[PDB]
UniProtKB/TrEMBL annotation, chain A:
Residues 9-35 form the RNA polymerase sigma-70 domain. Interacts transiently with the RNA polymerase catalytic core. This is RNA polymerase sigma factor RpoD. Residues 1-37 are annotated as: Sigma-70 factor domain-4. Residues 10-29 bind DNA. The chain holds residues 564 to 613 of 613 of the full protein. Belongs to the sigma-70 factor family. RpoD/SigA subfamily. It is found in: Cytoplasm. Sigma factors are initiation factors that promote the attachment of RNA polymerase to specific initiation sites and are then released. This sigma factor is the primary sigma factor during exponential growth. It comes from the Bacteria.
């Protein structure tokens, strides 16, 4: 739910993008892995107050 | 040196480069920068794209090749 009124489910997103649900899942997992890769999001890691 | 002892996974490379480094058995960037261009090129399944990417990332992160490490465990 980023920069929009509401979020969209994975199936509606796949339908809008003409991409299967599993391919959408794999692309999301690749994006999450790339964000978990180091040398990035250092301020995001610093955003924890514990 | 804070960036000499960092893990090799910070090199933002591809899976091909990652498995090449795993085969080379070098988990540290400080130990990895001791190799040379001909040695890197002669390794199988390692083209010019990986060399260009690693050179670009080293230049971006204030590192280069051809330097030697002294008293490095």
């Amino acid at each position: 739910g980023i920069d929009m009124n509401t979020d969209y489910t994975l199936e509606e997103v796949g339908k809008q993008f003409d991409v299967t649900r599993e391919r959408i899942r794999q692309i999301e997992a690749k994006a999450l892995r790339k964000l978990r890769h180091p040398s990035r999001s250092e301020v995001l890691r610093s955003f924890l107050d514990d | 040196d804070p960036i000499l002892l960092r893990p090799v996974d910070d090199l933002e490379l591809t899976v091909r480069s990652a498995n090449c480094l795993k085969a080379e058995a070098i988990h540290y960037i400080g130990d990895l920068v001791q190799r040379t261009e001909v040695e890197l090129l002669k390794t199988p399944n390692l083209g010019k794209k990986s060399l260009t990417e690693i050179k670009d990332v080293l230049a971006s992160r204030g590192l280069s090749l051809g330097m030697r490490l002294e008293n490095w465990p």
